[PDB]
Amino acid sequence: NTIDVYPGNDFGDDDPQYQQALKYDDLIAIQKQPWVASATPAVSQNLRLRYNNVDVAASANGVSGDYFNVYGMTFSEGNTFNQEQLNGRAQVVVLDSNTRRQLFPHKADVVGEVILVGNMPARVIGVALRVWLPYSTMSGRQSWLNSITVRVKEGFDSAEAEQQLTRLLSLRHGKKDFFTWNM
């Protein structure tokens, strides 16, 4: 019913070699196929994070709920998004270690705090110079892709759909810098 698409050679492939291996043109190429119900991108921008007079250049990454497990990331503090928050387009944010250390130089716990992603307020709900938000929260906002969710059409076997997706993307890159997850 749902096929996610991530950059990297497989699950856990953290290598920043491939972090933009997915393009918007790939999105258009996917949407154009019969078995595709929809294809929502997960977009990422460079922005400036400000909190009580401190400002750091950072990267807001719109991701899905499973992004951290997919790249084998563990949480120093807090949780990840749940699907009511992803579908509610809620404004919650996960910091990485360095964003936390510089916008909150010595605070004991940070979950509940409110930072300003660009000019949109976001509530810190966890910690893992990058910050992550629900892709639905960022979809309305020069950028790149870090994930693609592909909803399949009814009547279509998701496996042969996954194989046509895989041969599509693989035919459009000249590499296999990506991997899929058929959920």
Swiss-Prot record:
It is found in: Cell inner membrane. The chain holds residues 310 to 507 of 648 of the full protein. This is Macrolide export ATP-binding/permease protein MacB. Part of the tripartite efflux system MacAB-TolC. MacB is a non-canonical ABC transporter that contains transmembrane domains (TMD), which form a pore in the inner membrane, and an ATP-binding domain (NBD), which is responsible for energy generation. Confers resistance against macrolides. The gene is macB. It comes from the Bacteria. Homodimer. Part of the tripartite efflux system MacAB-TolC, which is composed of an inner membrane transporter, MacB, a periplasmic membrane fusion protein, MacA, and an outer membrane component, TolC. The complex forms a large protein conduit and can translocate molecules across both the inner and outer membranes. Interacts with MacA. Belongs to the ABC transporter superfamily. Macrolide exporter (TC 3.A.1.122) family.
